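Data availability (excerpt). The following record was deposited with the supplementary files.
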Amino acid sequence: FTGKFEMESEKNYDEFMKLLGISSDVIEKARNFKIVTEVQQDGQDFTWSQHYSGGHTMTNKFTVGKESNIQTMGGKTFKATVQMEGGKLVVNFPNYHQTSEIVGDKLVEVSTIGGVTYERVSKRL
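Predicted structure:
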């Protein structure tokens, strides 16, 4: 997982963002942000950073198997426990499922809420 990754692809961004309840005007603007993810893994400990066009940053620090609270790029916090399952980091929370995986030097992140699945693929820098 350790690396710096730049988003190159995403599936179902609009459908996912509407479900979060964010305005169409903000969806349209936010769609054009470049997202760079920087990850540092030290054993069980992760530091996980998202850097957005403009220089805003969101950092989460968690231990696999420990309860933690995660915040999102905008700033919405939630309690969760990250599990290592088959190569994936997996997170759960009321009505929300999230995975992060390295697939052939790419970082692939999947979030599912109900029938809606968002995917992000980020190339390694």
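Summary of structural features: The first strand starts at residue 3 and ends at 11.
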